[PDB]
Amino acid sequence: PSAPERLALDYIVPCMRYYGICVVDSFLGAALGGRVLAEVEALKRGGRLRQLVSPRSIRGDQIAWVEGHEPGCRSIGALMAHVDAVIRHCAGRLGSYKINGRTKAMVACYPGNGLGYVRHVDNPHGDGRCITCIYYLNQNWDVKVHGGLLQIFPEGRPVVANIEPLFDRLLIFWSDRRNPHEVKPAYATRYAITVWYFDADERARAKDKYQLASGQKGVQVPVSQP
Numbered sequence: 037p038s039a040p041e042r043l044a045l046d047y048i049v050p051c052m053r054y055y056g057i058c059v060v061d062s063f064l065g066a067a068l069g070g071r072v073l074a075e076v077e078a079l080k081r082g083g084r085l086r087q088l089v090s091p092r093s094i095r096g097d098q099i100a101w102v103e104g105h106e107p108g109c110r111s112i113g114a115l116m117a118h119v120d121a122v123i124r125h126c127a128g129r130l131g132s133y134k135i136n137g138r139t140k141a142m143v144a145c146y147p148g149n150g151l152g153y154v155r156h157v158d159n160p161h162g163d164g165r166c167i168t169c170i171y172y173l174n175q176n177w178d179v180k181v182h183g184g185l186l187q188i189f190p191e192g193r194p195v196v197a198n199i200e201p202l203f204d205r206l207l208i209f210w211s212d213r214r215n216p217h218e219v220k221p222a223y224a225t226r227y228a229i230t231v232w233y234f235d236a237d238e239r240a241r242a243k244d245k246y247q248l249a250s251g252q253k254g255v256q257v258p259v260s261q262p
């Protein structure tokens with residue numbers, strides 16, 4: 037067993053099997069995590085992270101879609117490889133899900149505008165995305181001061197998952213009805229990278245209609261090998 041294999045079998049698999057939610061702290065370590073943050077901010081400064089209106093209407097996310105091989109996206113690429121490796125090692129142990137592919141990385145800036153995101157389900161209408169992964173980059177973050185707490189309400193288990201958006205934290209959860217969630221108002225700028233993994237059969241059905249998500253949120257790219 038390699039380090040990502042050990043993490044999957046001893047931790048991620050039983051977490052996803054039972055709670056459908058998994059949190060991994062110090063996922064990349066301080067050094068590479070630092071390098072990922074550096075690149076995201078460099079993307080932000082280059083004007084590479086790009087609509088307001090769709091009770092709450094006004095958004096504010098500045099996003100870019102990163103494949104991983106672009107100039108100054110190497111560390112982001114390395115993050116994706118590490119997340120991929122972890123998902124690879126879960127194959128056949130998460131149930132019926134065949135995960136062949138995923139979205140590109142959604143590198144995102146979430147400014148402290150004092151607004152949260154209302155209770156939502158990532159994939160309400162069978163668009164093919166089965167697993168959401170969010171990698172957070174916020175150092176010195178205190179929720180009681182800066183807000184921005186994620187709360188997931190899993191349908192299987194009578195609990196609240198209160199997830200602080202902490203630097204070098206990987207969050208993994210089912211994208212469908214099982215995990216409705218809301219992000220509380222925040223009062224400082226945040227960065228996070230999100231990938232969604234596709235279920236082969238569900239995304240095939242979705243494409244057979246056209247119930248796939250719009251834009252890059254519905255564009256498939258293969259999962260990395262070792």
Ligand SMILES: N#Cc1ccc(-c2cccc3ncnn23)cc1
Nearest residue numbers: 146153170172201219226227228
């Ligand atoms: N850091 C940070 C940070 C803030 C907000 C969101 C965000 C926005 C919109 C929908 C949604 N669902 C789950 N997280 N999330 C993700 C990461």
Ligand SMILES: [Fe+3]
Nearest residue numbers: 156157158217
């Ligand atoms: Fe969400």
